Amino acid sequence: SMNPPPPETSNPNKPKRQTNQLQYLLRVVLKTLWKHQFAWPFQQPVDAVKLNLPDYYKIIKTPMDMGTIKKRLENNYYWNAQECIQDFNTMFTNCYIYNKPGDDIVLMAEALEKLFLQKINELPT
């Protein structure tokens, strides 16, 4: 009936680094997806209270969104680039679990995922 607290976006107890791959994930990958026509349902956690989706957090136990990913990159939350790529993959997979194949929101997610896969295939050394 209530929303869960959003995912953690900062942890001072975890070591921090800047890498070319982490910089690419913020400046190219997230930037590209964030400005997309279909980004907006994915820019913040699913508000299941406001959207009247009482079953959402009854089946989605690893929620993820691009608002969370943006803050995690900004706060140096990720040590390895694959940690960030996994969060994008979790966000897409969650959409493909809760929603029937061919649904409006699934088609929007698929359009974003096509662009995501192109950019990850060009991830720098």
Ligand X SMILES: N[C@@H](CCC(=O)O)C(=O)O
Ligand Y SMILES: COCc1nc2cnc3cc(-c4c(C)noc4C)c(OC[C@H]4CCNC4)cc3c2n1[C@H](C)c1ccccc1
Of 84, 95, 112, 113, the one binding ligand Y (CB under 6 A) is: 95
Of 3, 6, 9, 21, the one binding ligand X (CB under 6 A) is: 21
Tokens of residue 7, six digits: 């995912």
Residue 21 interacts with, from ligand Y, ligand X, none (CB under 5-8 Å by kind): ligand X
Rg of the chain on CA atoms, in Å: 15
CB of 34 to ligand X, least distance (A): 24
Any idea what DSSP says for residue 4? Answer: P
Residue 23's closest CA among 86, 57, 74?
Answer: 74
Tell me whether residue 26 or residue 106 sits nearer to ligand X (CB atom): 26
Question: Which residues, in sequence order, are CB contacts of 17 under 8 Å at separation 6+?
Answer: 76, 79
Tell me whether residue 34 or residue 98 sits nearer to ligand Y (CB atom): 98
CA 66, chain centre distance (Å): 4
CB of 17 to ligand X, least distance (A): 11
Binding positions for ligand Y, rule: CB under 6 A: 41-42, 46, 51, 53, 56, 95, 98-99, 103-105
